[PDB]
């Protein structure tokens, strides 16, 4: 039973591919950002960056360049994937439909060749004559760029320089020229070659080869006015052009290496330089003219523009605005001011794009304890570390549909109100005034109002009807006063302004040129609603007057004129539903009973009698629930009012209970402002609470976090954090930034005398590791405990050990030194967070690195390097060794379930152990024998075990049970293979959706969330065999029908890939491809499932229609 469903809940956010140009058209500047498999195109507009089109490559983008061949009006895009799938894309707009087409595609991988150390390099000739690639050592791939080359046929040129650091295409050269920095035993050199397509070879080169600094990194091709190249190594910048040679060694650059570069001026005068520390530099190419004619470089100057996020990209768009593409943190859009500020910096941040970055660790926690989980992840690194929380979800006072504009609608002027008092508020658009009016009375309150026609707003108060206004200026719609009652349990609409007052009641339709008498019979009971529910945008035209009787809520529906109770249908919720209001969706209206305590009832309203429809059950909090239909979109959904209100959203026939993004409200009137429907003037019961599948909250740490663990007993998060500190001979060590560890309410330092077992330089960068106790409400650092010097905390667990009632924070740390390949000393420290202090309990010095720790059965099992240990928490509060397991290289990852243990090795695949309580030591039940270089592990069932490769792959190994009694029971068979394309960092058990009604024969069993280094979160859920076969057939048919953006085969993209083996993917279903079935047009939907057999009702397999398939896909996507 190994059939899994992998679907990305959150798409990757880290930026690696990156360009700007005229892609969409020849007039609008574009910014193209590639995040792993995602490519997004933005049009630089007046408002800012306008999203235009987001596409998904069937591969990891490694090279993206924008080039304009002669004749083409707009730039074409060259995209190469990590599987060497080169493609050329053109943006083609069809007026309304938006597509990008592949004008040429092809695989460029070679069966012979070692991939280069400096990664894939892809460059385009300035005249667009050819495309150059440096994929393998000793070879240079050249793709001619003729229009005939629809298949991208390339030829390989052999060059003596095997180790090439960076290669660029030069400007101003007649024949195409490459200038590259190569490394040989003599050092590092810069050399130029001329590419001959006719000869398919390398010629002499425009200028000689010169010896450059030993740490030259990358090359910049200066444009025509200057020519030549710029080599920017560590602590040195050089400019080479023929005999012209310039060199500078600025002191500022030497601090950290330059990573990225960009061209600001088209003539090449100014360049932007990134850095590992995030600082942004500007390099100036000063020019001088020789009398007349040629112009030449005069000097090279670099200036520190400021500090930005750690940048994988600098990209000057225009108007002094630079996009900073960050892989280790949030991306930025910053502005280069002409003058600096306090603490002089010319860079000011304008916009921040959220990036989950490297998700080192994460946990699923139910802070609200309602039933829906939340994801708290350790994100970012260095100064970009954060604590993002991912959650799945979507006196002024008064409530009324004030139709000030009969056709424009919305709302201009309102009425404020206290508890028992009210007063019209002069909302003249965006501004308000507080001036008392003589003609009004402010001693009474109004809860519901409405407007009928001619802007006839009438003040409502208990005593009588009085009006001093500007638009109505007349009491035309006079509401009667039988017994002077307040506005309670009354509903009024735009057509009629009626509130529940008195008992001697006749129908209230006092408006010009009509007087209706629908309610004529004497009725003592005070009806909550005496109005009609419109179907759509109709006003005053009710298709039916049937609303049911609040007394019994019988299932059989009775029309109001008949007023005869039909056959009784008792419901479990004998208590009457709190508020029953019809809500009309896009095209569907349903009868919903909003019973606050429980037993919610949903029904479908048919014509006349209406019979009955299906029923649904979803529990809510112990709070009254009010059904509030809101008209602000094409779908006029309803708004619940329970403890956790549900804004139900419509599907074909299955409505989804979306959660609100706020804490809780009781009686709120949403505003239909199209500018920002999310942010409104909403109040609360006593406060003013103002108010996208996933919501991310960022808690900056300014230091790199490692591990996170939740403690519900103390309601706190333990976070392992690392701080980079520069150490100087004077003053000891000084912090670089006021990070989270330094900024703590209370702080402590570890004092362990068992580690008696080195002086660093005056500028060595040391790492100080701390454990931070963080409140779960304010997310502030309550405590910060600093470990010993040269001690790295690798593992953290919060658990209850043995018979001790107390809950402990247990941290595994290793003492690291510059001269040791492997740590030889470690500690397993136990803390108890009693009250604002991290009291230490036990130390337990160990001889190795404690890579991971898991609480087993009330016992702590740790992983010292090449060892798996079991510790007993004795009554003396000291860990005592119980059993050891040595047959491993390093137990990097430990996962447990029951009595079974899963062990991940650095080289070997997962190893499955089993504690034997009788004898009292581990036994190797089975072990996978395929070397896989683990990155994360997870145990799904008692048989299937999930593992993540370091080559962006997933696999599932099954403990064989049908095997005969032999050594063949000791083999874990790799039964499922998949190429995720992302480096999985953490596996966890949980879900981001409501955990209710999960036993109703759901297609997917279990739920595993994995977080990767690119900032994406994915779901793995097991499927049954029949559902797996149906989904595999669906996948094949969709692959046949839909067309990839790069014309890349999906099976090739998803096939398990490694330097040694390329086995096709089995036992895995691509959730993204399955969910993409909903985005294809109806004729294309019928093209799929054309001859597919579906067994829905019973064993018989009818010819499956599109509707059944949509049902299956939507049910699958509910869990996502």
């Amino acid at each position: 039973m190994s059939y899994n469903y992998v679907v990305t809940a959150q798409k990757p956010t880290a930026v690696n591919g990156c360009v700007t140009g005229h892609f969409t058209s020849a007039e609008d500047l574009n910014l193209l950002i590639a995040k792993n498999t995602r490519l997004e195109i933005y049009v630089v507009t007046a408002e800012g960056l306008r999203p235009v089109k987001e596409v998904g490559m069937y591969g990891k983008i490694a090279v993206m360049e924008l080039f304009r061949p002669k004749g083409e009006s707009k730039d074409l895009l060259f995209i190469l994937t990590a599987k060497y799938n080169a493609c050329i894309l053109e943006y083609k707009q069809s007026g309304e439909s938006i597509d990008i087409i592949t004008r040429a595609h092809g695989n460029v991988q070679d069966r012979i060749g070692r991939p280069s150390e400096t990664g894939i390099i892809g460059i385009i000739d300035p005249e667009c004559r050819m495309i150059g690639l440096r994929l393998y050592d000793g070879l240079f791939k050249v793709i001619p760029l003729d229009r005939d080359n629809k298949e991208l046929k390339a030829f390989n040129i052999r060059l003596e320089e095997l180790h090439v650091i960076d290669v660029k295409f030069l400007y101003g050269c007649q024949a195409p020229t490459i200038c590259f920095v190569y490394q040989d035993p003599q050092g590092r050199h810069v050399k130029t070659y001329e590419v001959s397509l006719r000869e398919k070879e390398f010629n002499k080169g425009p200028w000689k080869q010169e010896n450059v600094e030993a740490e030259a990194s990358m090359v910049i091709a200066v444009p025509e006015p200057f020519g030549g190249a710029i080599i920017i190594g560590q602590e040195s910048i050089t400019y080479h052009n023929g005999d012209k040679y310039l060199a500078i060694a600025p002191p500022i650059i030497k601090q950290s290496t330059i990573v990225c570069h960009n061209r600001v001026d088209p003539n090449g005068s100014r360049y932007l330089l990134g850095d590992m520390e995030g600082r942004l530099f500007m390099l100036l190419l000063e020019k001088e003219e020789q009398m007349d004619g040629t112009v030449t470089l005069k000097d090279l100057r670099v200036e520190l523009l400021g500090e930005t996020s750690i940048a994988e990209c600098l990209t000057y768009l225009d108007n002094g605005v630079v996009f900073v593409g960050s892989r280790l943190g949030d991306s930025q859009l910053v502005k280069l001011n002409v003058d600096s500020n306090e603490q002089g910096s010319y860079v000011v941040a304008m916009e921040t794009f959220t990036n989950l970055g490297p998700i080192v660790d994460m946990c699923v926690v139910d802070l609200e304890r309602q039933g829906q989980g939340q994801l708290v992840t350790c994100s970012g690194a260095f100064k970009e570390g954060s604590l993002r929380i991912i959650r799945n979800g979507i006196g002024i006072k008064g409530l009324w549909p004030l139709r000030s504009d009969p056709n424009r609608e919305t709302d201009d002027t309102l009425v404020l109100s206290f508890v028992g008092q009210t007063r019209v508020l002069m909302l003249n658009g965006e501004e308000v005034e507080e001036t008392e009016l003589m003609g009004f009375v402010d001693d009474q309150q109004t809860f519901f109002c409405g407007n009928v026609a001619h802007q006839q707003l009438i003040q409502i108060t208990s005593a009588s009807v009085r009006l001093v206004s500007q638009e109505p200026k007349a009491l035309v719609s006079e509401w009667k006063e039988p017994q002077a009652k307040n506005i309670s349990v009354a509903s009024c609409n735009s057509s009629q302004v009626v509130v529940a007052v008195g008992r001697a009641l006749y129908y209230l339709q006092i408006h010009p040129q009509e007087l209706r008498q629908i309610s004529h019979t004497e009725m003592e009971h005070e009806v909550a609603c005496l109005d009609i529910t419109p179907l759509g945008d109709s006003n005053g035209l009710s298709p039916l007057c049937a609303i049911g009787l609040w007394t019994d809520i019988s299932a059989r529906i009775l029309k109001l004129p008949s007023f005869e109770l039909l056959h009784k249908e008792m419901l479990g919720g004998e208590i009457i539903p709190r508020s029953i209001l019809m809500t009309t969706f896009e095209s569907s209206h349903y009868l919903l009973c909003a019973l606050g305590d429980g037993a919610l009832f949903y029904f479908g309203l048919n014509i006349e009698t209406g019979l009955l429809s299906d029923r649904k059950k979803v529990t809510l909090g112990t709070q009254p629930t009010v059904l509030r239909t809101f008209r602000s979109l094409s779908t006029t959904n309803v708004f619940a009012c329970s403890d956790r209100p549900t804004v139900i959203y419509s599907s074909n026939h299955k409505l989804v209970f979306s959660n609100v993004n706020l804490k809780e409200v009781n009686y709120m009137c949403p505003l239909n402002s199209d500018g920002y429907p999310d942010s409104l003037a909403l109040a609360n019961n006593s406060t003013l609470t103002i108010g996208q599948k996933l919501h991310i909250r960022t808690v900056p740490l300014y230091e790199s976090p490692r591990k996170i663990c939740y403690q519900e007993v103390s309601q706190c998060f333990g976070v392992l954090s690392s701080r980079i500190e520069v150490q100087d001979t004077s003053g000891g060590t000084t912090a670089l930034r006021p990070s989270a560890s330094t900024q703590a309410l209370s702080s402590s330092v570890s004092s362990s005398k068992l580690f008696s077992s080195h002086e660093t330089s005056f500028g060595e960068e040391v790492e100080v590791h701390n454990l931070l106790i963080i409140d779960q409400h304010t997310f502030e650092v309550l405590h910060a405990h600093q470990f010993l010097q040269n001690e790295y905390a690798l593992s953290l667990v919060s658990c209850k050990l043995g018979k001790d009632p107390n809950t402990y924070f247990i941290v595994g740390t290793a003492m690291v030194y510059p001269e040791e390949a492997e740590p030889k000393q470690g500690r397993i420290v136990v803390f108890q967070y009693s009250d604002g202090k991290l009291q230490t309990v036990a130390e337990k010095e160990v001889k190795g690195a404690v890579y991971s720790m898991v609480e087993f059965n009330g016992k702590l099992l740790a992983s010292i390097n090449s060892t798996v240990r079991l510790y007993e928490w004795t009554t003396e509060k000291e860990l005592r060794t119980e059993c050891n397991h040595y047959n491993n290289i390093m137990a990097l990852y430990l996962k447990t379930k029951g009595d079974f243990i899963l062990v991940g090795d650095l080289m070997r695949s997962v190893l499955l152990l089993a504690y034997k309580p009788m004898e009292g030591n581990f036994e190797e039940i089975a072990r996978d024998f395929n070397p896989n270089w683990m990155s994360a592990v997870e145990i799904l069932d008692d048989d299937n075990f999930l593992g993540a490769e370091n080559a962006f792959n997933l696999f599932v190994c099954q403990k064989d049970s049908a095997a005969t009694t032999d050594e063949e029971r000791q083999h874990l068979q790799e039964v499922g293979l998949f190429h995720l394309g992302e480096f999985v960092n953490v596996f966890c058990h949980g879900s981001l959706v409501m955990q209710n009604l999960g036993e109703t024969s759901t297609p997917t069993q279990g739920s595993v969330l994995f977080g990767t280094v690119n900032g994406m979160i994915g779901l793995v859920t097991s499927l049954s065999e029949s559902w797996y076969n149906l989904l595999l057939d669906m996948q094949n048919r969709l692959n046949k029908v839909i067309k990839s953006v790069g014309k890349i085969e999906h099976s090739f993209w998803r096939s398990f890939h490694t330097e040694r083996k390329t086995e096709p993917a089995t036992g895995f279903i691509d959730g993204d491809l399955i969910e993409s079935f909903l985005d294809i047009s109806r004729p294309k939907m019928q093209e799929v499932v054309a001859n597919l057999q579906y067994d829905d009702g019973s064993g018989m397999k009818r010819e499956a229609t599109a509707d059944d398939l949509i049902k299956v896909v939507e049910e699958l996507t509910r869990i996502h």
Binding site: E47, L305, D318
Partner: peptide, 19 residues
Amino acid sequence: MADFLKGLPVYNKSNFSRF
């Protein structure tokens, strides 16, 4: 106000005037 940073390239003056 020197030529160190003044005169940055612009496509059109209205590309970010109302960000």
